[PDB]
Amino acid sequence: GDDLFVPVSNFDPKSIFPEIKHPFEPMYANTENGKIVPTNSWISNLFYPSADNLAPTTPDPYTLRLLDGYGGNPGLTIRQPSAKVLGSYPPTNDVPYTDAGYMINSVVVDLRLTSSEWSDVVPDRQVTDWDHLSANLRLSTPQDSNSYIDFPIVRGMAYITANYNNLTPQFLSQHAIISVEADEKKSDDNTSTFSGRKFKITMNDDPTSTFIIYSLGDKPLELRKQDNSNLVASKPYTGVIRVAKLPAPEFETLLDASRAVWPTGGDISARSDDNNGASYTIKWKTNSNEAPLLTYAYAHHLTSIDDSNVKRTDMTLQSATKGPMTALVGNEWTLRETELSPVEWLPLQAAPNPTTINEIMTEINKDIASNYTQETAKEDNYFSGKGLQKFAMLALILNKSDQTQLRNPELAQIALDKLKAAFLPYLQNEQADPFRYDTLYKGIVAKAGLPTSMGGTDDLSAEFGHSYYSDHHYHQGYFVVTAAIIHHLDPTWNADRLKAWTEALIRDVNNANDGDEYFAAFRNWDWFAGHSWAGGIKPDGALDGRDQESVPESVNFYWGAKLWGLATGNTPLTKLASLQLAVTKRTTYEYFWMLDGNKNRPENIVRNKVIGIYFEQKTDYTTYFGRFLEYIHGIQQLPMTPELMEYIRTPEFVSQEWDEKLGAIAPTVQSPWAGVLYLNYAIINPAEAYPALRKVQMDDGQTRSYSLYLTATRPHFFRR
Numbered sequence: 001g002d003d004l005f006v007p008v009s010n011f012d013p014k015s016i017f018p019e020i021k022h023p024f025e026p027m028y029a030n031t032e033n034g035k036i037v038p039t040n041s042w043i044s045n046l047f048y049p050s051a052d053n054l055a056p057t058t059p060d061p062y063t064l065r066l067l068d069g070y071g072g073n074p075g076l077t078i079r080q081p082s083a084k085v086l087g088s089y090p091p092t093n094d095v096p097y098t099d100a101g102y103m104i105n106s107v108v109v110d111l112r113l114t115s116s117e118w119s120d121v122v123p124d125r126q127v128t129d130w131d132h133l134s135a136n137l138r139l140s141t142p143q144d145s146n147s148y149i150d151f152p153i154v155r156g157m158a159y160i161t162a163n164y165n166n167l168t169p170q171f172l173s174q175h176a177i178i179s180v181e182a183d184e185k186k187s188d189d190n191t192s193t194f195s196g197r198k199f200k201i202t203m204n205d206d207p208t209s210t211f212i213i214y215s216l217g218d219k220p221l222e223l224r225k226q227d228n229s230n231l232v233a234s235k236p237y238t239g240v241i242r243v244a245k246l247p248a249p250e251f252e253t254l255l256d257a258s259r260a261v262w263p264t265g266g267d268i269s270a271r272s273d274d275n276n277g278a279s280y281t282i283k284w285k286t287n288s289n290e291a292p293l294l295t296y297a298y299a300h301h302l303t304s305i306d307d308s309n310v311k312r313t314d315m316t317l318q319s320a321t322k323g324p325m326t327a328l329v330g331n332e333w334t335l336r337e338t339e340l341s342p343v344e345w346l347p348l349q350a351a352p353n354p355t356t357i358n359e360i361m362t363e364i365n366k367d368i369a370s371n372y373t374q375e376t377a378k379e380d381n382y383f384s385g386k387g388l389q390k391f392a393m394l395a396l397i398l399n400k401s402d403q404t405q406l407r408n409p410e411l412a413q414i415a416l417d418k419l420k421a422a423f424l425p426y427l428q429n430e431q432a433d434p435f436r437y438d439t440l441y442k443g444i445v446a447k448a449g450l451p452t453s454m455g456g457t458d459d460l461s462a463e464f465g466h467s468y469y470s471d472h473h474y475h476q477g478y479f480v481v482t483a484a485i486i487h488h489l490d491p492t493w494n495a496d497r498l499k500a501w502t503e504a505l506i507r508d509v510n511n512a513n514d515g516d517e518y519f520a521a522f523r524n525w526d527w528f529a530g531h532s533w534a535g536g537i538k539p540d541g542a543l544d545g546r547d548q549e550s551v552p553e554s555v556n557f558y559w560g561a562k563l564w565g566l567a568t569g570n571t572p573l574t575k576l577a578s579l580q581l582a583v584t585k586r587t588t589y590e591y592f593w594m595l596d597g598n599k600n601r602p603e604n605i606v607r608n609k610v611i612g613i614y615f616e617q618k619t620d621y622t623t624y625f626g627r628f629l630e631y632i633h634g635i636q637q638l639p640m641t642p643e644l645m646e647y648i649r650t651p652e653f654v655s656q657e658w659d660e661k662l663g664a665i666a667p668t669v670q671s672p673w674a675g676v677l678y679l680n681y682a683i684i685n686p687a688e689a690y691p692a693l694r695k696v697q698m699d700d701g702q703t704r705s706y707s708l709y710l711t712a713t714r715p716h717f718f719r720r
Contacts, residue, residue, distance in 0.1 A: 001271035004278065004576040007516040013437045013444065013504045014518075016497075017429060022440040023451050024460075024468065024537055030128045036442050036520045039469035040533045042546055042616060043135040043153070046127045050541025054107065057135075058545050058616045059157050061296050061317035061325045062245075063105065066139070067123060073172055073230075074123060075114025076139065076151055078160055080245045081105040082207050082318055086604065095629045095665055100604040104618045105320050109174035110203070111211055111243065113149065113160065115167040116232055117141055132521070133266040133282065133528060141167070147236075154263035154284075155528040156295040158255070158315075158327055159214075159242040161262040169221065169233045169241060171213065175203035176228040193224045194231075198256075200246070201231070209245060212252070214259045216240040251315045254327075258294035261286050268527050270512075270579060272572075277338040278579035279306075280527060284331050296325040297333075299600055300530050300583075300590045306334040320545075320617050322529075322591050323600025337582035340575075341647040343559070344566060345396055345488070348646050350403035352712035355719060356690070357405055360712065363705035364394055364406065368415050375700075376422040380463050381433050381446060382471075385478030386701030388423060389556075389639060392482040393706045395419045399489050406709070416489055423482055427494060427501055433463055441537075442520045443469060443508045460539070469536030473524040474550060476505040477557030478639075478701075484563035491567075499568070506561055512576060524554070525580060530587040532557075545616025549624065550635050551588055552644050555581065559643040585648055593636065593653050609657040610636050629665055630673040633657065637680040639701050645683060645710055654683045672697040679707050686714035 026037040026047035037047050045055040046066075053067045053074075063081065067074040088101040121142055129136045133155045140148035150163040183196030197220050199213040215221045217239015226232045242262065244255050263284050270280035284293050296317060297305070310330035319325050342348065352360060368391075376387035397404045398412035425431045435444045436454070449467025450456030460468045466475055483502040486493060511519040524532045526546075532554040533546040548554070558577045565574030589595065592614060594606040605611075605619070610633055612621040623631045637649070658681065666677050674696035682689035693707045711717060 001273045001279075002572060002575065004270040004272060004280075004572050004579060005268070005512040006572050007513045008503045008507050008511065008570070008573060010516055010518070011500050011503060012518060013507075016501055016504060017435045017437040017444055020436045020438055020445070020450065020454060022438045022445070023454075024539060025440065028125045028127050030126060033129060035130065038130075038520060038523065039441050039443070039536045040472075040524050040546065041132075042155075042526065042529070042533075043127075043130055044537070044546070045541055046130075046135055046137055048537075048539070048541060051543065055541030055543055056545055056617050057153065058320050059153055059155050060298075060319045060322070062157065062160060063320055063617065064153065064160075066125065066137070069109070071120060071122070073112070073114045073170060074118060075112045075170070075172075076137075076149070076160070076162070077109050077112045078243070079105065079108055079110050080209070080317060081320060082209075084602070086602065089627060092627065098621060099607060100602070101621045101627065102612075102618065103321070103601075103605055108205075109172070110205070110209055110245075112172045113162050113241070113243065114170045114172060115149070115164075116170050117147060117167055117236075118170075129265075131265045132268055134264065136264075152262060152264045154265065156297060156325070157263055158258065158294045158296055159244040159262060162241045162243075164217075164237050164239060164241055166236050166238055168236050169215075169223075171201075171223075171231040171243075173203055173229050175205045175209070177201050177225065177231060178204045178228075180223070180225060180231065182223075191225070193222065195222045196220050199223065199231070200252075212244050212246055212255055214242045214244075216242065216260065245317060247315055247317050251313070254294065254313060254315060258291060258329075260290050261288055261293055263293060263295065270576070272575040272579070275338070276340055277336060278340060278575055278582070279334055279336040280579065280583075281335075282333045282527070284333075286331060289331075292329050293331045295328055295330075297328045298322050298325060298528075298530065298590075300586045301328075301333070301335060302326055303590075304335040304337065304583075304586060306336055309334075321615065321619055335583075337579055337586070339582065340578040341581050341643065343642045343646050345485075345563065345642070346400060346403060347642050347710060347713035349713050349715055350400070351405045352709055353717050356708065356712035359694075360705055360708050361406060361408060363703075363708055364398065364408075365411065367394055367703045367705045368411060368418065372418050372422040377425070377432065379432060380448070381426070381431065381466070381479075382464055382475050383700060384426070384431065385475055385482075386639070388419075388426075388482045389478040390701050390703050390706065391415070391419050391422065392485045393641075394703060395489065396485050397706070397709060404709070416486075419482070420486060420490075420493065423486065424494075426479060427497060429501075437518075441469065442518060443472070443523060444504060445469065465536060468538075469523070471534050471536070473509045473532055473557040474534060474553040476509055477553055477560045480505055480560035480564055481556065481641075484560060484567045488563070488567040502564060506564060506573075509557060510561060510576075510580075524557075530583045531591075532584070544618045547613060547615045549613045551584070551592055552636060552638055552640075552648070555584060555643055555648050556639050556641060558584065559641060581643065581647070588648065589650075589653070593657075595653055595656055607660065609633070609653075609660055629661065630669050630671070630677060633662055634673045634676045634680075637676050638699055640676075640679050640707075640710060642710075649680070649683060651684050654680060658684060670697075672699045672702075675699050675702050675707065679710065682707075682711035682714060686711045686717040687720045690717065
């Protein structure tokens with residue numbers, strides 16, 4: 001097959017964007033290993049301080065915190081949530097009530113690895129190394145670097161691995177430790193001290209937690225039950241100690257068998273195949289090849305993985321927000337996607353029902369006579385981008401009249417020319433909020449959120465946090481789509497500049513190779529989670545981890561990337577984007593858009609149909625704008641493109657969502673969300689969506705003409 005992890009290019013973005021160094025630096029990063037600190041990664045919190053040391057890092061199924069607590073015995077705190085906390089809020093307007101408005105994980109010290117030497121002191125912290133799937137976190141005695149613990153923190157790890165170095169191991173819990181068994185010695189009269197290299201312990205929590213501590217160093221541990229919550233060794237220790245939660249008795253030997261091998265990272269590759277499929281492969285890095293690796297897997301892993309070189313166990317543990325994980329045996333995972341999207345520029349049925357063509361033409365006329373400057377030159381790049389794309393669609397469908405049957409060449413010409421005039425200022429980096437190239441985190445950033453001395457407002461929420469690397473896929477997706485459409489219709493128009501600029505945006509979001517030395521790799525994509533993260537650098541910590549709200553705007557980025565691939569004949573880019581869109585679809589229906597029967601959420605959450613704002617540690621049935629229904633569900637319905645309508649949003653889910661929630665509120669919505677909702681509705685009922693779309697308000701990234709065109713190109717459209 002063909003390699004998908006190759007550079008888009010190694011074009012130097014300093015030629016287009018004024019160079020800066022980002023003002024907010026990664027405090028705990030080893031700066032000399034030549035590596036780029038990721039901004040939108042599951043490991044990102046590790047690099048910075050956090051409010052009360054509570055920022056969580058979530059390899060899954062373990063949740064980890066660092067040096068949390070009152071200062072008594074700080075270390076690495078482990079939480080493995082068997083159960084969730086569900087809550088709600090009272091209504092604020094009159095819409096039907098919500099049963100469960102959120103899902104959280106309690107902040108509890110299930111178990112903590114620390115040392116007696118760290119009593120009442122503040123250990124030093126360093127991220128010594130990291131890759132897409134891991135980070136090595138070193139906690140050391142302050143100003144005594146020779147006494148430390150290395151924690152290889154890796155996605156899916158079934159144990160917590162701690163390389164102790166000249167330190168006295170201490171294990172504490174917020175729970176009571178109510179049983180200790182050493183080296184499987186059942187009948188000892190001594191209830192106070194325990195010796196050996198295996199310690200099975202139980203807590204008095206609910207449900208009952210059972211942990212096993214393996215000491216893998218040569219010298220056996222001698223632990224004293226100092227009190228109901230503390231096990232303490234007597235002298236300094238040097239060697240690897242691993243602790244695993246035991247999900248059930250029948251799995252103990254499994255954990256015994258896999259204790260000598262731990263992950264230290266992983267290498268990711270991806271290839272397309274002959275039969276219009278693609279795959280990606282994780283090759284876990286381990287300390288040894290003594291036994292095969294034991295690693296926990298998300299649900300979508302299970303549905304997409306190649307079973308030929310991996311063995312499934314029945315061993316399961318709850319992830320923080322993705323439902324049950326299932327342990328898999330093997331050092332190499334290959335995940336396959338065999339049904340890649342067929343969507344390109346247009347609806348799969350490019351020509352609308354004949355009886356609508358005139359109607360659509362009338363509307364398209366009106367839509368093109370819009371004031372483009374007013375609707376595409378906004379305060380911020382985000383809404384500007386929405387406007388640009390919405391007009392780009394009109395230009396596209398007029399200029400593919402052979403397929404769309406929307407023939408009006410004068411209008412086609414004007415649509416493209418106005419699109420170009422509206423777009424050019426962004427191409428020239430002379431829009432209201434121009435970009436900068438950041439040499440620190442290797443990406444592009446809006447000027448607006450930078451400090452005063454750089455010409456910014458010094459408000460890091462400016463441009464919705466773009467300057468601190470939030471929401472880049474969202475913002476840059478619109479510009480990449482518009483650029484691809486222009487370059488498709490007019491390949492020589494500002495070709496060099498258009499290509500370098502557009503590809504800079506693409507590389508900023510989704511660089512797949514370190515041969516591109518100017519951009520961090522996969523800023524917004526997570527190959528383990530199988531979706532994208534939006535939330536970027538968060539001073540004082542992202543206390544619920546990474547977040548993502550809009551699935552369609554991520555989708556819209558990768559669709560844009562695909563379109564750019566098609567417009568430039570870049571097969572690896574096109575296939576990469578296709579693969580990421582497929583994985584996106586998969587995880588979208590595993591975790592975000594919930595069909596009845598979904599096993600990763602309780603019934604009352606599934607009943608919400610969408611997950612709301614999705615975090616690593618919590619899910620919230622709300623929006624950043626507010627806890628309003630049409631917003632919550634609507635955000636997952638725009639921008640409506642052939643990718644969203646033909647491939648990502650299935651009629652089955654649209655149906656379930658409509659019957660469960662939206663059908664009752666839609667006729668009462670007197671806002672632009674009505675346009676969003678009914679265009680969404682066109683997926684299951686285009687015949688009735690169509691007259692509604694003739695009347696209701698359009699979202700600011702939506703046009704009436706494009707809406708009618710998408711509805712009329714549903715195969716089951718008809719006249720009622």
